[PDB]
Ligand binder design. Structure first.
Ligand SMILES: *[C@@H]1O[C@H](CO)[C@@H](O[C@@H]2O[C@H](CO)[C@@H](O)[C@H](O)[C@H]2NC(C)=O)[C@H](O)[C@H]1NC(C)=O
Ligand SMILES: *[C@@H]1O[C@H](CO)[C@@H](O[C@@H]2O[C@H](CO)[C@@H](O)[C@H](O)[C@H]2NC(C)=O)[C@H](O)[C@H]1NC(C)=O
Ligand SMILES: *[C@@H]1O[C@H](CO)[C@@H](O[C@@H]2O[C@H](CO)[C@@H](O)[C@H](O)[C@H]2NC(C)=O)[C@H](O)[C@H]1NC(C)=O
Ligand SMILES: *[C@@H]1O[C@H](CO)[C@@H](O[C@@H]2O[C@H](CO)[C@@H](O)[C@H](O)[C@H]2NC(C)=O)[C@H](O)[C@H]1NC(C)=O
Ligand SMILES: *[C@@H]1O[C@H](CO)[C@@H](O[C@@H]2O[C@H](CO)[C@@H](O)[C@H](O)[C@H]2NC(C)=O)[C@H](O)[C@H]1NC(C)=O
Ligand SMILES: *[C@@H]1O[C@H](CO)[C@@H](O[C@@H]2O[C@H](CO)[C@@H](O)[C@H](O)[C@H]2NC(C)=O)[C@H](O)[C@H]1NC(C)=O
Ligand SMILES: *[C@@H]1O[C@H](CO)[C@@H](O)[C@H](O)[C@H]1NC(C)=O
Ligand SMILES: *[C@@H]1O[C@H](CO)[C@@H](O)[C@H](O)[C@H]1NC(C)=O
Ligand SMILES: *[C@@H]1O[C@H](CO)[C@@H](O)[C@H](O)[C@H]1NC(C)=O
Ligand SMILES: *[C@@H]1O[C@H](CO)[C@@H](O)[C@H](O)[C@H]1NC(C)=O
Lengths: 68, 404, 184, 49
């Protein structure tokens, strides 16, 4: 953390550089925090961005109510 | 007889910048023999590392409890029309690179060596996205998404339900909907101008930042302090003083530095406990004032709370507590009961109101006189037991149906 | 483990130090050892004070929670559980407590056409406590939590003014329950 | 009690030490007693905060 691994599969983030992790464009949920929105999890090691949650944006209607 | 738009701002810090400094380089620097000497002194450095990791994880927990309260991410609709209200000041600006609201950008602009710092796990962009999602949830879906799945609700229905929560009917809302929207927009513009013209509005975050800066500067000065020794530099002592000698000098130096850093750690964890209590209060404010309508007195701001519009802030959170404050009162005649046909009549949901000639019924918060009938009143007891009862007739709507 | 450290002394054992070293400096070594143990104890008791304060704050919060939504029902939303809380049956725990909160969650939502009120006979019939819904050709009044359709009548709807100032109103008949008794 | 304590020094009053002891090791005794008074007072202010 705090430096770049070039002056020591390595991915460099704002917090620091992680050695041994492969960056994946898909975003999952991590259990171990790292920093700066970067998350890593076992299965070698996948590195991604922490998922904010499920995406659900219903269109606003001024004449329709979703009464259960 | 008239309604006045009211809104008050509140400031609540959430978390500070976590720090983690290795004890060996902090006290003894690069001296290997000093590290060997402190190896057998104790496990104090392990205690400091455990304490700082605990502070970091509890700050992260406080931040995710304050902000990440929803399992669903909501996006604003492309049509920015909800019956005439204005949402440009609260919605994020796509043109801005920070993807924040103009008020959020304004408050971000207002808020301004041997040590290492750690960036937060969640930056301001994700906090802004969380705030935008929860604003979209409380605008488009109301409080339905707070207690389950998101359910669509009209915005005028939302103001009607919020007004009925405090005891205001929807007829006055329908009569002056445009007036309500104009008053809300004027109040929003006025408080935006006030926040732009107040450099000390966000003084709590500035005070926290200044306290942290003063603490780190004081600890740096204490590191530079000699603590009653020959010099404050260990390397000069090693290159000048006898290697068998100066052991007591370096021991007193490292124990003075240890006392200074333990005072710093104690005051830092006590400040962390203070900010944990503040974050708990902010979490309660999010859970009660933000997600739903709270009937608690003097909890969601001054006056009768209607809705709150929280937004992302650096090292804290802001409160757009839009409330209701009545005004333009007038003197009216009061009677506890009406004596009609030898029986006492009481209002079911209002209070008897008169101008001196005719008796009517109105709510306790607004002046809406209505004809006293049988459906909106209930009859019990007699007239002689009660005190202050006056005489008036009660209109019966059933009679003209069979009068003809 | 703090008792098994030298604290700058030659050894962690005090009887050997007293027997070997001269008491003029053995007393200084003993004083250094006991004052180092004194700072160890003061750090431990300050940590104990912090932990006790945190435990007391958590206990006060739990006491407020059980006063609100255990003895009775709390009208606050999401105070002690996600969703609409109904009842709770807390259980005991060693040096702690667990709150078993039971909540209410709606399900099976359905779209319904709605209107702010009903414009009938030149007047607006606002609902007293419900909301008007439509299934495509007929209008019904329901609550804000459950789908309970009902015919719009005069008892459950109140009229305050006409039906021209309002926006988005629709036209529908209002059935007066008093009429059929004298209709015959 | 803390300010009346000797804290392992010779006397609790600096005047007697200054007027009796030689300038060597008198500053050592003074430093020891005042730093005992310090650690007592930082502990004290921690309980009051
Ligand atoms: C309550 O007070 C406000 C403030 O004076 C009134 O709003 C004014 O309304 C008049 C005409 O209705 C306008 O010409 C003014 O420009 C309005 N002023 C503002 C600041 O909005 C409002 O009408 C009053 N309410 C009632 C029921 O009379
Ligand atoms: C909502 O309020 C904003 C802020 O006043 C309005 O934006 C203004 O629009 C006018 C033209 O209609 C411009 O002359 C101003 O320069 C705009 N101000 C700012 C700060 O951008 C906006 O029109 C209002 N309505 C909607 C639907 O957004
Ligand atoms: C008290 O208020 C009532 C309700 O408005 C007044 O009654 C009406 O007053 C207007 C003009 O003031 C008349 O045109 C109506 O015919 C009145 N209606 C009835 C049923 O009487 C009443 O005049 C007011 N009294 C005073 C002293 O101001
Ligand atoms: C309100 O009306 C009642 C009757 O409708 C009044 O009661 C009468 O009071 C007078 C003198 O006080 C008696 O002589 C009558 O016998 C009473 N009538 C009945 C039916 O009991 C009552 O006084 C009126 N209230 C006021 C304040 O004048
Ligand atoms: C809306 O609900 C009403 C009330 O149930 C429906 O009216 C009845 O519909 C059933 C079958 O759907 C018929 O058997 C009845 O004869 C209808 N009642 C009357 C008085 O004719 C109505 O059909 C529903 N509309 C839609 C589009 O679902
Ligand atoms: C509900 O009924 C009213 C009453 O007929 C309708 O109002 C009429 O609207 C037409 C269209 O402009 C006018 O020519 C009439 O003069 C209006 N009548 C009155 C008494 O004002 C209204 O349009 C109807 N609304 C709907 C949605 O059907
Ligand atoms: C990454 O390495 C480059 C050198 O190629 C350096 O310029 C840059 O500052 C490093 N990144 C960080 C965050 O230090
Ligand atoms: C009612 O009348 C009294 C007597 O003059 C006056 O002091 C008071 O301000 C009036 N209140 C209102 C609301 O007009
Ligand atoms: C209501 O209709 C809208 C638009 O078709 C749709 O997005 C939404 O899922 C519907 N809701 C229900 C409960 O059917
Ligand atoms: C709902 O909103 C749309 C566009 O914002 C508008 O055209 C429509 O008239 C609104 N519905 C009512 C009942 O006013």
């Amino acid at each position: 953390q705090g430096v770049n691994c070039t002056e020591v599969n390595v991915f460099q983030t704002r917090a620091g550089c992680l050695i041994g992790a492969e960056y994946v464009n898909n975003s999952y949920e991590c259990d171990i925090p790292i920093g700066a929105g970067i998350c890593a999890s076992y299965q070698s090691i996948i590195a991604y961005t922490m998922s904010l949650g499920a995406e659900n944006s219903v269109a606003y209607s001024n004449n329709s109510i979703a009464i259960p | 007889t008239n309604f006045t738009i009211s809104v008050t701002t509140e400031i609540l810090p959430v978390s500070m910048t976590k720090t983690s400094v290795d004890c060996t380089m902090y006290i003894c620097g690069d001296s290997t023999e000093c590290s060997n000497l402190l190896l057998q002194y104790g496990s104090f450095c392990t205690q400091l590392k455990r304490a700082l990791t605990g502070i970091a994880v509890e700050q992260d927990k406080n931040t995710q409890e304050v902000f990440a309260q929803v399992k669903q991410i909501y996006k604003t609709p492309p049509i920015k029309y909800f019956g005439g209200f204005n949402f440009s000041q609260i919605l994020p600006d796509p043109s801005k690179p920070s993807k924040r609201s103009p008020i959020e950008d304004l408050l971000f602009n207002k808020v301004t060596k041997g040590l290492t710092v750690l960036p937060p796990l969640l930056t301001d962009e994700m906090i802004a996205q969380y705030t935008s999602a929860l604003l979209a949830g409380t605008i488009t879906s109301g409080w339905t998404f707070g207690a389950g799945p998101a359910l669509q609700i009209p915005f005028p229905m939302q103001m009607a339900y919020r007004f009925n929560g405090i005891g205001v009917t929807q007829n006055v809302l329908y009569e002056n909907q445009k007036l309500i929207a104009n008053q809300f927009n004027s109040a929003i513009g006025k408080i935006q101008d006030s926040l732009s013209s107040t450099p000390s509005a966000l003084g709590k975050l500035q005070d926290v930042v200044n306290h942290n800066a003063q603490a780190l500067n004081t600890l740096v000065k204490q590191l530079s302090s000699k603590f009653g020794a020959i010099s404050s530099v260990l390397n000069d002592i090693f290159s000048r003083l006898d290697p068998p000698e100066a052991e007591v000098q370096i021991d007193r130096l490292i124990t003075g530095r240890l006392q200074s850093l333990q005072t710093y750690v104690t005051q830092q964890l006590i400040r962390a406990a203070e900010i944990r209590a503040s974050a708990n209060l902010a979490a309660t404010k999010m859970s009660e004032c933000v997600l739903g309508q709270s009937k608690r007195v003097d909890f969601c701001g001054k006056g009768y709370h209607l809705m709150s519009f929280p937004q992302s802030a650096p090292h804290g959170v802001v409160f757009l507590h839009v409330t209701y404050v009545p005004a333009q009162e007038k003197n009216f005649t009061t009677a506890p009961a009406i004596c009609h046909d030898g029986k006492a009549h009481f209002p079911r949901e209002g209070v008897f109101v008169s101008n001196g000639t005719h008796w009517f019924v109105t709510q306790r918060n607004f002046y809406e006189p209505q004809i006293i009938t049988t459906d909106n009143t209930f009859v019990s007891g007699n007239c002689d037991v009660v005190i202050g009862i006056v005489n008036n007739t009660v209109y019966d709507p059933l009679q003209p149906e069979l009068d003809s």
